Design a protein around this ligand. Sequence first.
Ligand SMILES: CC[C@@H](Nc1c(C#N)c(-c2ccc(-c3cccc(Cl)c3F)cc2)nc2cnccc12)C(N)=O
Ligand SMILES: CC[C@@H](Nc1c(C#N)c(-c2ccc(-c3cccc(Cl)c3F)cc2)nc2cnccc12)C(N)=O
Lengths: 322, 312
Amino acid sequence: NLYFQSMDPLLSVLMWGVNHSINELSHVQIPVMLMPDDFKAYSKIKVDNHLFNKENMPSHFKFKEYCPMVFRNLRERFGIDDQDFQNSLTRSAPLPNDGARFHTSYDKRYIIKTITSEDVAEMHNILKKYHQYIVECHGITLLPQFLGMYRLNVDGVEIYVIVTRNVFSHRLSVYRKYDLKGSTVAREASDKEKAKELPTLKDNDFINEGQKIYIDDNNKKVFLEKLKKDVEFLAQLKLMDYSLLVGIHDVERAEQEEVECPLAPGEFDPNIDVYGIKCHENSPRKEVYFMAIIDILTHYDASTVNPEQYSKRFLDFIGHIL
Amino acid sequence: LYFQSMDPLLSVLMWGVNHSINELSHVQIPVMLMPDDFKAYSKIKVDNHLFNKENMPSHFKFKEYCPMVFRNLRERFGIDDQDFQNSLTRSAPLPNDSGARFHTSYDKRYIIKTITSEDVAEMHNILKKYHQYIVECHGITLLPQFLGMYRLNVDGVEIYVIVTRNVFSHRLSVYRKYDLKGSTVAREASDKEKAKELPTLKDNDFINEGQKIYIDDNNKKVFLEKLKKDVEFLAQLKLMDYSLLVGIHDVERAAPGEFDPNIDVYGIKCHENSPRKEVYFMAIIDILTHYDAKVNPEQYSKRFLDFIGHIL
Ligand SMILES: CC[C@@H](Nc1c(C#N)c(-c2ccc(-c3cccc(Cl)c3F)cc2)nc2cnccc12)C(N)=O
Ligand SMILES: CC[C@@H](Nc1c(C#N)c(-c2ccc(-c3cccc(Cl)c3F)cc2)nc2cnccc12)C(N)=O
């Protein structure tokens, strides 16, 4: 059964705190609708164990959840059941990707990131507009899905954490990934980065490697129409420096790595892998693309391009590569 | 389940038991308890801002004493942790009446009583010997079954709480109830006490009413043999001032007269030749008075056993 053990005590507190948060909400009514107070709310928990569970958990920790009712409503609006979320974040420890550091949930559904107190403050600044935007697009958006936000304290180490939905497939592997922005001199992966297993490539890598993305005219028009709305919303909030993250699944590469070791090859569940787009019938390779916006929370007040200019250049760059 | 109550302390108790048991489901059942488990505790302090402001208090603390020991006790007494959690939280405990106050779980399986910090210290003082006594008698005893001990804090007020098992049936009504000590001293329920629906009657009430408990020779032997061993243990811990609690169920006022002895563990049916079809619920309560509060514990125990033997 579930002990929340880790060598990383901050991961043990995160798994414990998500378990607690979700069980607590099981004892709080789902309201007709969110109110203003729900956007300034928190729950704080301080645990002090003495000679109790001293093996599998730290004895002294704090866990704080920001606006629990709002993130619960956001999970529901993005089609995520709270018990599934709880199992994803607690049944086995999140895995490190190894400042660039992130974790993935064990089942690769969710991304966990350490954020600053400035981030948390900016999150509260946008949370009402973000929530209403999610309402009006019926949860259909390329924006990050913010699913939970927490503060952890153990051993005198304080961190803030955000949980988002993975852009990539929980099952289909990515052999190539790009963080894309536009209009940035020398924006390309370092030598050390390109030497890794799965490098995070960037704008000049995408251009200089001849990267194409083969989606049909309909999927392109639907995708670019969402991007425009989402990026216009970000520019209204005065946000900038966001990326399009692009993951490519190569069906025949994935297949050759199985032979070394029921959805058909290249098929995915669009209710789980929500950012997936199939290639068109004339791709030179059978590929599946995963594409969405990440990393939105830079406010213009914090060469300085303005958010209008950033949004136009970004849309122009993505439009010119597809 | 929102743990709502007019009494904030009851919400905290229900939230706390709920949290306690869920937490223990994330903790291994040890091969055996160790000395540290008898000096252990869990503390949680909750501070909510504009969250769950309707059901629950926004600021509270909950401490569980020796959670590993009370979990083991619950198992040794044939109690599943999810049934226990259910009994204490599906619906608020009900107050007996209104120091003498107690609550009953909503399903009448358990007793919840506010105790002093002095009680909490004396429970820690006896708990290793009590646990090892429960091991030795295989959970067969008329002692109080100590199932959980806690400290609650809400809105400036702090209380300590013990949970025990109901001596009485979760189903069968008691029409008559005695607190018996064998004090040759005066022990009579008050006129106020006696005006109630169910008075707590005492030694001299039992004598003056000529109350009879008709048990067959085998049940009485087994019962007095347990009582002897239990009372000799109490005297060895230098505990005194405990009572036999006796509840009488009247079957004719009505299958009638039957009960599950895995739930109502203190039930004993009457002699077939009893002039009334009764069922008796009898066990020891209220053991935590140490002689060091200064008739001695040996004398108390012998005078106690003699009186119970006297009445059957
Ligand atoms: C390039 C990104 C990296 N992987 C990430 C990645 C990160 N880091 C993120 C991510 C980025 C930034 C933030 C974030 C920062 C500050 C404040 C707030 Cl509120 C935030 F939300 C959260 C999550 N999301 C991903 C989604 N799916 C797949 C891969 C992803 C990688 N190297 O592959
Ligand atoms: C006769 C007393 C009352 N009913 C009680 C009753 C009480 N009070 C108790 C009880 C008494 C004392 C304590 C107690 C005090 C101090 C410290 C510690 Cl550690 C204790 F455990 C706990 C529980 N147990 C009962 C069991 N079954 C049926 C009726 C019961 C009643 N009036 O009916």
